[PDB]
Amino acid sequence: GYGRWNQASVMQPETLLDLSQAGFYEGAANMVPKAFQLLVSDTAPDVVVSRVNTTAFPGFPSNTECYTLGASEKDVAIRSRYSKVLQWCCLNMSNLQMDGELYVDFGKLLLKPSVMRKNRRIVSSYTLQQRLQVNHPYTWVPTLPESCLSKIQEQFLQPEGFAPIGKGVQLTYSGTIKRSKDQLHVDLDNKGKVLAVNSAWVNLQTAWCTHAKGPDVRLLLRSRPPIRRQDVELFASTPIIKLADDDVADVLPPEHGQLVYLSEDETRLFERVSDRGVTITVREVKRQPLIILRDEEEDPRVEYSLSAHIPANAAKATDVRAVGLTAFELAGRLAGLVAEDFVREYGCEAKL
Amino acid sequence: DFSHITRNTVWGLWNEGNLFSLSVPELAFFLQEHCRVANVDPRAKKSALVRQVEEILSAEQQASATVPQEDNPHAIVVTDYEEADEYGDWGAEPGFEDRRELDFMELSPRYDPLSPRAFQLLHSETATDVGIASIDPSKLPGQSKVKNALAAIHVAPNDANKMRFRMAFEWCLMNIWNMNMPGELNIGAG
Amino acid sequence: AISFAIAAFGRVKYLDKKLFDRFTRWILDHSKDLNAAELLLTIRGVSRVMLLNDQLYDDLGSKAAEKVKEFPIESQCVLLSSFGSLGVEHERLASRMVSSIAENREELTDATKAVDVITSL
Amino acid sequence: VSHLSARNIATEALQMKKLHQERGGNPMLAQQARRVLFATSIAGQNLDARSVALLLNTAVYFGMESDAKLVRECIDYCLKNDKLITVDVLPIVVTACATLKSRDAREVIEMQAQKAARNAKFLDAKDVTNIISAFSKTGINHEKLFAFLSRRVQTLARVGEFEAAHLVILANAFSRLRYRDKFLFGAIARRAMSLRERVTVNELVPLIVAFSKIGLKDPKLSKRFATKAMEYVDQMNAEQVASMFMAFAYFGIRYDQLFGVLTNRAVELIDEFNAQYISTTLNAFQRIGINNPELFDNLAERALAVVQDHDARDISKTVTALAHFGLKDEELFKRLASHAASIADQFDAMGLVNTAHAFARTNFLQQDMAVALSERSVYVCRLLDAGETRRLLWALAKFQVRDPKILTPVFNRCLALHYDFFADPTGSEEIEEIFDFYGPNFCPPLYQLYIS
Amino acid sequence: NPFEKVARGIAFKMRSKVHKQGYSNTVMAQQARRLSPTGLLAMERLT
Amino acid sequence: LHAFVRSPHYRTIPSAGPNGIVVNRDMLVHQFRDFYKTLQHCSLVDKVHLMSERPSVEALRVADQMVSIGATFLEMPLTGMEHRATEFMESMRYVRGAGGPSTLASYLQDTENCRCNSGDVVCLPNGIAVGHGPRTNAVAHTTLKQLFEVKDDQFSFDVFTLEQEGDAPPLGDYFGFAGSNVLLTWKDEHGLLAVDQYQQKQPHTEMNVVYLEPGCHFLSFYGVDHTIDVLVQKGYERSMDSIAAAGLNPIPVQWSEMDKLGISMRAAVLPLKFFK
C-alpha cells in the first residue's frame, strides 16, 4: 500500500494475455504418434473393377457404358495395407530422429466380454478396430507348445541362413522397476550383477494379424526412450536381488523404487543375414516367473521371438518395406508348421 | 552434458514456454551440438543462452502450422486438373459409436420418383464383416481362472449378407408401418 | 507482497494459474482485515487477467463498499471501471459508490470522466 | 474455482489472429494463442452464437483439431442448439468444421445444408457467395441446395449486383465442387463481361482457370476470353502466364495469335521461372501439339540451375513431355536421372510406369535408376491396368531384369488379366517385342494363351 | 524438396496432436480414477 | 432506408389492363432493370433487395402490407386481402432477413375493426397525417392518437386528420412531402382541398408549397437522413421545372406502361427503417 495508489499508470495497449504451462508436452506416454491394426485372415475387404461385352441386350448394347464388379485375392490386401502403414510409421519415426526395431511374436489373442454387445456375432472390422482402442480390452498372452523343436529346426533354418551362434542355454534374470514417474527394465546375470538398465518400451506400430486354429502373429514396431545415465550408474552399486542357495530375495531400498516383476530366463539365439545387411534373429525364452504382481502370469511359459534392426538411416537408403514383407512371409511358415500340435494334444482352438 | 537432452525435449519445452527450467551446461551442449554454433564463452548466464537458443529455433522453423480459415482471391492453384483414415487405423476418431444404428445403409435427410431413399450394395464373393466366437482358454499359461474368452474369426459372406438384409428389413418395416402407406415388396431378376 | 505481486502481474497480463489459485485461496481465508489502498491494488490486478470468480469478487466488493470515504475520486472511477470491464454485477457496490461521485461532482476534471463513469455503470 | 472470461478471451484471440496474419506470422503469436486457448473452457457461462463461432474459428486457424478440449466443447452447442445459427455466422461455422476428421464434425454440416436448402431464396449477393464458398471446401454434394443457389445466382445476375470480386469466388467454388451448368456459367461470363475495364488481370486469370477446370464446354465462350486476354498480357508475371497457358491448352482451341504473343512476352521473365511450374507449361504443349522449339530450348536451358525444387510429379511430367520433341540432351538427363533416383522413394504407380516408359524411350539406361525403379515397381504392380501393366513389363524388359522376385508378380497379374492384355490393338507391337525379347520359358500359360 | 517440407509439416502436426488433453488419454485417466470394489466400503468405514 | 421491390412475371403478365389500352410485355421487363438502377443510385434509399418471382401480377404491389412510421412497424389489417395472404407471408421473410419484427402492429392489426391502407398515413416533421376518406376510419386515427402522440416543448408530435372526397385517391398518391420545408401537391381539387386542410392546422409550420400538374406519380421520403432529390415520371415536363425552381434536384424515371397497368410510386417500393 505505497507509491501513489491514486495515480494508476497508463496501461500500454500492446499487452495481450499470456499463460505459462509446464509439463503439458513432457511425459513418456505423450511421446510419439501411434497407430493400430486389426487383421483377420480369410478376408477380402475390396472390390475389383471389370468390364464385359453385353451384345445380347436390346437397348444400349455398347460395351463402353458397361461396368461390373468382381472379387479379389485374400493376402494381397492385408499385405499391402500392412506395408503401407509400416512405411508411414517408419518414415515418421525417422523424421523425429529416433531409432527402433521390428518385433515378431507367437501366441494367442483373448478379448474381454466388453467388446461383445447385445448378443451380436457379425461386426464390421472398422467397428471392432475402433472399439478396441478405448480401454485396451485385449489380453494377449505369449505362448507356444514345446513339443515341436524336433520339426522347428526342420523349417529350412539352415537353407534360409538361420544358424546357431553364441552359447546356448544361457541363464539370466529379467526384472522391472516402477520409479516415481516412469518404468525401467533390468537384465541381471546368473550371479546377480545387473547387465543392462533400459527404459520401458513404447510401441509405435501395432499389428494383430490373427490366424486359423493355429497360432496368430502380432508384428510390432518398437522404440526405446532415452534415460539419464546418472540413473543408469545409480542402479549398479545398490544391490537389487540377493541369490541364496535356492531362493532369491529382493533388497532394493524403498527410496529407489519397487520390484514388481522378476523372472528367470533360459536363452539361446539363432541368426540369419540374407545378403542384404538385415539381421533376422530368432531367440528362445523358456521363462518361469518368480516374482509377480498381477494374477494372470502364474505359469511356466516358453515362447519364440523374431527380430531385426532398423537404425535411423533407412529413410534414404534402406528399403524398409522389404524387411516387413519378408518377416510376414516367413512367420506364416512357422505358424503353419506348429499349427497341428497347437490344437492336437496341447491347446484347444474351436473357431466356429 | 549428456544424451537425455534431445531435439524433441527442447522442442516440447519451447512450445510450453518453460525453457528456463534448464541448467547452463545443458543449454551450452544443445547449442554446441544441435544448433551447431561456432563457439560459446563459458561465462554467459541463462538469459543470453536462452535468447540465442530461442532465436535459432524460431529462425529454422519454417513448417507453417496455421490453416487459413478464410476466403481469398488472386490465389492460383492447379490440383484437381481421408483415404488413409478410410480404414480407420491412425488413431481413435473422437465421438464414435454415439450415432443411430445406420452402419449397414446410407441414409440422407416427400415424394420423388427415381430417388432411392436408402441404398445398400451387396456381394456374394466379397463381404466386409468379421465375426466373434467363444473359446476355452483354460489350457493357456495364465488364463486358468477364466472360462470364456472371445476371439476374432472370419465368417461366411452369405450369413453376413442375410444379417444386413434383415437389419435393413426391420427398419423398413417399422418405417412403412409408421407411415402406414400401402406396402409392396418386389424381388426382380436381371 | 500479495497485493503488490497481484498488481504487478495484472499490469502486464502474465496470469499464472496455480499461483493465482493459491493467492485467491489465501486472500479468501484472511479477507476481513485488508486495509484500504490494497483492495484497489488487487481488484484491478485480478480483473485485468480475466478471472471470473464469484465468491472472491463478492467478498472484495462487500469490503470495498464498507470502506467508501477512504477512496478518492479517481480511485472510485477506477474501481467502478474494473468491475465494469469484465461484466460482473454488484448492486450494493454501485449504489454505495455512485453517491460519493455524485456529491463530489464539482471536482471532476471535465464531463468526459462523467460520461465514462455512466458508461461503466 | 477459477475460469477465464470466454467473451474477452474471444476478443483477444481475434486481435491475436489479426496481428499474426497481417505481420508475417512469427511462431511466438501462434504459441501464445495456443497457450491462452488451451486453458479456455466454455462452461456455465451464457455465450451467444457469435462468441462461440469466433472461438471455433480462431482455434481451428491456430492449428487445433478434435484432440483439444475447447474444440470438442465447441462442436457441441451446435449439435443441440441449431436454431441459434444465422446466415451471418453460418459460413464461419461451416468452413470451421471442414478439415476436422471427427464424425460429429460431419453431422453438423449436414444440418447446415438443410438449413441452407430452404433459405437459398431469401439471401443477398454477399450471403450467397459466402455460403457457396463455405460449402465448397467441405465436399458435400446435396443437389437440391446447389440447384437452388444456382437459380438465386442467375436471378441476381440479371441486374448487375456483383462486384468484380465475388465472381471469382463463385466460379472457383462451383468448379471445385464439380457441378456443371451452361446457364449459370453463361450468366457469370456475361456479368463479368458487363464490368468492362474493372476486372484486372489479377482478377481475370482465376476466372479463366475455373472455367477451364470444367472444360467440358462449347466454343464462342473461350473465343471472347481470347479477345480480353490480348491486352492483359503486359502486366502479369510468370505464374499467371503458365496457369492461363495450361487453361487455354485444356480449352482445346488453337489460338495462334494468343499463343504467339504469349511466347513473345514469356521470354523476358524466363529468370523468374522457379522450375516448379515448368512442368505444366511443358506438358500443355504435349496436350495441344504446338511444337515451337525456341521456347522449348529456352526452358531446357533453365533446368540444371533449378533441379532440387523438382519433385517426383514434376520430373515425371517433364520427361513425359520431353518424350515428344526428343532432344535427348544427356547433360540435363544424367542430372535429372540422379535427382529422380534420390526422390524415387516417394512416387506414384501410374507415374512410375510413365517414368519407366519414357526412360526406355529415350534409350538412356544407367544402373542406379534402373535397379531402383525395378525395386520399387513391385509395390505398385498390383493395381496397374492392362496397358499400364504392359508398359511396365516392357520397361523391365528393356531394363534387362531377370530377378524372379520381380518378374513373378507381374507375370501373375498379366496371367490373371490376359483377356484385356491381349485385346489392345494399338499396343500390339509392344507385346510383340516383349516375348521375342524374353522367350517362351518363363510362363508356359502365357505361351499357349498367345499361341491361340 | 517441397515433398520434404510437406513431410516435415505433417510429421510435426501429428506430433503436436498428442498431448495430455487427448480423448483416449482422458479415458485412461478416468479408468485409473475408478475405485476398487472394496474402495467404496473403505470410504464408508472412514466416514 | 430499406427498400423492397418485386420483379414482374413475364409469362402471366396480362395485356390490355383495366383501361382499354394494350401493353407491351417485353417493355415492362426492359424498364424494370433501369428503374432498379435509378432507385439504387438516387440516394433516397440505403439498400434495395430483389424479391423473388410470383405468378400473380397483383403481387407486384410490394406495399399495402406494412408501414414504417418510426423504429417500429405496423402491419395492415386483413380486410379483403385474404386471397393473397399467402404471398404476404413470403414478403415478411425478406424483411426479417435483414431486420427485426418490431412491434408487429399487434396494437393495430388487432384493433377490433380496422380499415387501413399503406398511403393513407404519411409522416412529416413532428407530425403524422391520416387521410380520412373511403379507406381509413376514425378508429385508426384514435389508435394513432393513443400510440404515436407526445406533447411538450421538445416532445412535440402531432396528428392531422385530413378530410377528402369519396372519389379521391389515397392520400400518399397526390400530395406528398420532401425534406427542407418543401411540400409537393397536385394542382387539382383534391390537392387544393388537402393544402387548405393542412393550412387550417398548425399555422406556424411555415411550409412552402410547389404545385404539379395532376396525374403525376412521384416518390419522396422524409427519412432520418436529409436529402434534396425527388423521383418524377418522365412525362409532364413542366413539373420538373416547377420543382427545380425551388432548389430540389429532380430525377426522371419512365413509368408509361406500368401507369397504364395502374401502379404508382408509393406501391412500387416498400420503405423501412432498420436500427440496432
String of DSSP letters for F23-67 = --HHHHHHHHHHHHHHHHHSSS-SEEEEEPP-S-GGGG---SSEE
Distance between E42 CA and the closest CA of chain B, angstroms: 27
Q: Quick check: A21 and D345 CB within 8 A?
A: no
Three-state DSSP class for residue D407: helix
Distance to chain C for A181, nearest Cα, Å: 21
* Contact map slice: E 16-45 vs D, CB within 8 A: 16-19, 21-23
Q: Which residues of A touch E5 (CB under 8 A)?
A: none
CB atoms within 10 A of CB A149: 12
Q: For residue F270, how far is the Cα from the chain centroid?
A: 8
CA distance E38 to chain D (A): 31
Chain B residues whose CB is inside 8 A of the D209 CB are 76, 78
Q: What is the residue whose three cell numbers read 544448433?
A: B35
Which letter does DSSP use for residue F160 in this model? Answer: E
Chains D and C touch (3+ CB pairs under 8 A): yes
Q: Is F252 strand, coil or helix?
A: strand
Measured distance CA(B114)–CA(B119) in Å, rounded: 12
Chains that touch F (3 or more CB pairs under 8 A): D
Nearest to D67 among E2, E3, E23 (CB): E23
Residue D229 grid cell: 486476354
Closest among B14, D128, D357, F82 to D136, alpha carbons compared: D128
Closest in A19, A76, A83 to D36, CB measured: A19
Question: What type of residue sits at position D71?
Answer: V
Closest by CA to A172, choosing from A75, A79, A44, A262, is A262
Three-state secondary-structure class, residue A170: strand
Distance of alpha carbon D77 from the chain centroid: 34
Long-range CB contacts (< 8 A, 24+ apart) of B143-149?
Answer: B143/A110, B143/A139, B143/A141, B143/A296, B144/A298, B144/A299, B145/A295, B146/A110, B148/A113, B149/A110, B149/A111, B149/A139
Cα-based torsion angle of the residue sequence A18, A23, A28, A29 in order, rounded to the nearest 10 degrees: -60
* D282 alpha carbon, distance to own chain's centre: 17
Are residues B143 and A113, on separate chains, in Cβ contact within 8 Å? no
Distance (Å) of CA B45 to CA B37, B41, B48, B52, F251: 17, 10, 6, 11, 79
Q: Which of C13, C35, C44 sits opposite A17 (nearest CB)?
A: C13
Contact F209, F195 (CB under 8 A): yes
Q: Are B157 and B126 in contact (CB under 8 A)?
A: yes
HSE-CB for C77 with a 13 A CA cutoff: 20
Distance CA F216, CA F234 (A): 9
State the DSSP H helix or E strand holding residue A184, giving kind and residue range, or none if neither.
Answer: strand A183-188
For chain B, the residue count is 190
Report the C-alpha gap between A253 and D382 in whole angstroms. 60
As a whole number of angstroms, the distance between CA D244 and CA D208 comes to: 7
Mark yes or no for CB contact E7/A24 under 8 Å.
no
| Residue A329 cell numbers, joined | 512371409
Helix (H, G, I), strand (E, B) or coil at F272: strand
C-alpha cell at F28: 415492362
- Contact yes or no, A with E (3+ CB pairs under 8 Å): yes
- Among all residues of chain F, which has the CA nearest to that of D159? F33
Residues spanned by the domain of F118: 2-272
The residues pairing with F252 across neighbouring beta strands, listed in sequence order, are F232
Phi, psi at residue A204, to the nearest 5°? -85, -60
Grid cell in block for residue D97: 468444421
Please give the helix or strand (H or E) that residue A265 lies within, else none. strand A259-273
Q: Is E13 on the interface with D (CB under 8 A)?
A: yes
Chain E neighbors of D68, CB-CB under 8 A: 21
Chain C residue numbers with beta carbons less than 8 Å from the beta carbon of D3 are 51-53
Which member of E11, E27, E28 has the closest CB to residue A96? E11
d(CA D230, CA D224): 10
CATH of the domain at F128: 3.75.10.10
Helix H or strand E segment including A303:
strand A301-307
Task: State the DSSP string of E1-47.
Answer: -HHHHHHHHHHHHHHHT-STT-HHHHHHHHHHHPPPHHHHHHHHHH-
In Å, what is the CA distance from A290 to each residue of A145, A245, A300, C52, C109? Answer: 20, 15, 10, 56, 86
* Subunit contact D2:C53, Cβ cutoff 8 A: yes
C-beta atoms of D45 and C20 within 8 A = no
* Contacts for F1 with CB less than 8 Å, ≥ 6 apart: F45, F46, F47, F223, F224, F225, F271, F272, F273, F274
Q: What are phi and psi of F155, to 5 degrees?
A: -80, 70
Judge contact between D241 and D269, C-beta under 8 A.
Answer: yes
Residues of A in Cβ contact (< 8 Å) with C78:
8
Q: Count interface pairs B-E at CB distance under 8 A.
A: 14
Contact F211, F185 (CB under 8 A): yes
- Chain E CB contacts of B65 under 8 Å are 9, 12-13, 16
Report yes or no: D163 at the F interface, CB cutoff 8 Å: no
- Counted domains in chain F: 1
- Residue F88's SS3 state is helix
In whole angstroms, give the CA distance from residue F145 to residue F143: 5
Would you call B67 an interface residue with chain E, using a CB distance cutoff of 8 Å? no
Strand partners, A165: none
A30, E18: Cβ pair inside 8 Å? yes
**Given CA atoms D231, D235, D237, D239 in this order, what sign does their dihedral have?**
negative
Task: Give the minimum alpha-carbon distance from E32 to chain D in angstroms, rounded to a whole number.
Answer: 20
Flag if E8 and B65 touch (Cβ within 8 Å). no
Name residues whose C-beta falls within 8 Å of residue F222's C-beta, 6 or more positions apart in sequence.
F123, F124, F125, F177, F179
Inter-chain contact E15–A32, Cβ cutoff 8 Å? yes
Find, among F176, F194, F185, F179, the residue nearest to F242 by Cα. F185
Give the one of D66, D110, D213 whose C-beta lies nearest to B94's C-beta. D66
Q: How far apart are CA F273 and CA D428, in angstroms?
A: 78
| Sign of the CA dihedral running D225, D231, D233, D236 | negative
Question: Regarding beta strands F182-186 and F208-212, do their DSSP bridges make them parallel or antiparallel, or are they unpaired?
Answer: parallel
Q: Residue type at A121? A: R
CB atoms within 10 A of CB D306: 13
User: Pick from B144, B123, B147: which is nearest to B135 by CA?
Assistant: B147
Contact predicate D93/D71, CB 8 Å: no
Chain D residues in contact with F36 by the CB 8 A cut-off are 159
Nearest to A92 among E11, E22, E31 (CB): E11
Query: Which residue from A16, A24, A319 is facing D15, i.e. has the nearest CB?
Result: A16
- Residue E17 has its nearest CB partner, among A24, A31, A33, at A33
What was the experiment behind these coordinates?
cryo-EM
Residue A130: all three cell numbers together: 475402433
Question: H or E segment at B152?
Answer: strand B149-154
Contact partners, residue A93, CB within 8 Å, separation at least 6: A32, A100, A204, A221, A223
Do the Cβ atoms of D385 and D413 come closer than 8 Å?
no
CA distance linking residue F229 with residue F251, whole number of Å:
7
Question: Which chain F residues contact residue D159 at CB under 8 A?
Answer: 33, 36-37, 50
Distance CA F31, CA C109 (A): 62
H helices present in chain A, as ranges: 75-95, 125-131, 149-152, 157-160, 229-234, 320-337, 341-344
Chain center to CA of F34: 20
| Long-range pairs for B133-138: beta carbons < 8 A, 24 or more residues apart | B133/A121, B133/A350, B133/A351, B133/A352, B135/A110, B135/A348, B135/A349, B135/A350, B135/A351, B136/A348, B136/A350, B137/A108, B137/A110
Nearest chain A Cα distance for residue C37, angstroms: 6
Instruction: Please give the helix or strand (H or E) that residue A107 lies within, else none.
Output: strand A100-108
Say yes or no for a CB contact (<8 Å) between A8 and C14: no
* CA neighbor of A114 nearest in space, from B141, E31, E21: E31
Q: Which of D63, D69, D309 sits opposite E21 (nearest CB)?
A: D69
Q: Distance (Å, rounded) from C-alpha C78 to C-alpha C84?
A: 9
C-alpha distance across the termini of chain A, in Å: 82
Q: Which of E6, E13, E17, E24 to mutate against chain D (most D CBs within 10 Å)? A: E17
Closest CA to A95 of A310, A318, A315: A315
Pick C13's closest partner by Cβ from A7, A18, A21.
A18
Cell 400518399, residue located:
F172
CB contact under 8 A, E23 and B65: no
